[PDB]
Every structure is written in C-alpha cells, then in structure tokens.
Design a protein around this ligand. Sequence first.
Ligand SMILES: CC1(C)S[C@H]([C@H](NC(=O)Cc2ccccc2)C(=O)O)N[C@H]1C(=O)O
Ligand SMILES: [K+]
Ligand SMILES: [Zn+2]
Ligand SMILES: [Zn+2]
Length: 240
Amino acid sequence: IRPTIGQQMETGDQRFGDLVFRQLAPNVWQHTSYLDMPGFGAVASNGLIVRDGGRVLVVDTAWTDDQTAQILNWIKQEINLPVALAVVTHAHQDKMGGMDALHAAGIATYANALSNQLAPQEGMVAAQHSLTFAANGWVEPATAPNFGPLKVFYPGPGHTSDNITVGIDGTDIAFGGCLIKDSKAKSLGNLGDADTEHYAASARAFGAAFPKASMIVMSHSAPDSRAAITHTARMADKLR
Ligand SMILES: CC1(C)S[C@H]([C@H](NC(=O)Cc2ccccc2)C(=O)O)N[C@H]1C(=O)O
Ligand SMILES: [K+]
Ligand SMILES: [Zn+2]
Ligand SMILES: [Zn+2]
C-alpha cells in the first residue's frame, strides 16, 4: 500500500482489492495498480475511468490481466454501466499489461497504430483497433468512432515514440500518461525507449493541445497543476 515509486494513498482514495480509485470529477476517476519489484518494492501506475452517455471508457490497463479484471469489477460495483472501449497510451506493461482481460470481457480496444506494431516486441498484446494521427497530432476522426468526450492527441516522440495523450472535453482534466512527470520530479523516469531530442517539444505540444486543462493526470504521480508540463519540458530541455 506504500509504493516505492508513485504517489502514496491520501484522503479521497478508495481501496478495492489490490487497487486504489480516486474520483477526480463527477464522471471521471483515476485507477491505480501496483507492481511489486523483487528487491525494490511496489510501483504504482495510474489510468482513467470516464462515464459518458450511459457507458464507461477506460484509459490504460493495469499492470496485469488480473488487476485489469479488478478494475472491471470495481466499475461493475460502483458505476454499473457497460464498458464500451479502452484506449491505451503506449506499448509498455504499465499501460498495456492487461489487454487480454479487456478482450475477454468484450471491450473494444484502441491504441496508436505504432503501439500495436511495437506491442509484440514489447511483450504486449496489441489492441484490436489502430488510431492514426494527423501531422498536427490530432487523431484521425474515423479511426476513433464514438469516443464521447475523449480527445486523443499524439504529441510526438518523448517517453516512447508511440506515446499518446487524452483530454476529457467538458472537464478540467488532461492525461499525459508516462510522458508527463510531476512538477517536483527529479527525473524523467525510464528513458530507455525515449527520444531525448524531441521530448521537450512533445511535452510542450501536449500542453498546447490541451491549453485549458488545470488538472494534469499522469502515470506515476498524483494529479498536478500545469507546472508538471512546464517542469517536464524544462527537464527534457537538458537532454538536448
Ligand atoms: C520508470 C517507469 C515507471 S517503468 C514504466 C515502463 N516499464 C514497464 O511498464 C515495465 C515494467 C515491468 C515490471 C516492473 C517495472 C516496469 C517503462 O519502461 O516506461 N514507466 C516508467 C515511466 O513512466 O517513467
Ligand atoms: K522497449
Ligand atoms: Zn513506458
Ligand atoms: Zn510509466
């Protein structure tokens, strides 16, 4: 319950099985799951759950199929609406480790085409459907049908070459996934698959795609202010 990496539990957190849920807005919750590293401890990872138009939309899986099934069970108990689709934000275990559980539940899955192409090489199951992007970063609309309030944006290579981001129209929330680190972070996390030349511009592009959002949600820290974007970009400036 006390991760080595990731935010600790706080007031407003609901423990459900091995996961933690936090309501961020009337129709938006953050899911948190934990992977125990032998000799190191637990690493927390965050995604989103959105209620729109009688259905639920999921952003990112948990680390494993079992944890992702637990997300679906929490949805059933707390929201009790069908889960129409999930979007996963790049091909690494913290974001895509639970694809099989979504597929077995009948949930349609979407990822950047490049995420689907990298998925097997990264140990992940590909999503069923591929999103593609305009040169300006915005999703090609016919590849993202019935996405409700989700606004999917590819900011450019950064944490990985395939990383995508998601804003929730009608809210104060935008989700940077593993691209954005919090405003007090000391590092950019795992740079092993990263594009250090383009990272800073990609972080700034995320901020400019979602100019209004004041709640920046991210994979390994509690939601932060827009200072997370500026700090991430300035940390990334030093990589060039
Ligand atoms: C430092 C991280 C939190 S590690 C994570 C990701 N690694 C995995 O999902 C695999 C994995 C499997 C078992 C244990 C740990 C990791 C990656 O390589 O980007 N995201 C990084 C980040 O956001 O900076
Ligand atoms: K890799
Ligand atoms: Zn990653
Ligand atoms: Zn991560």
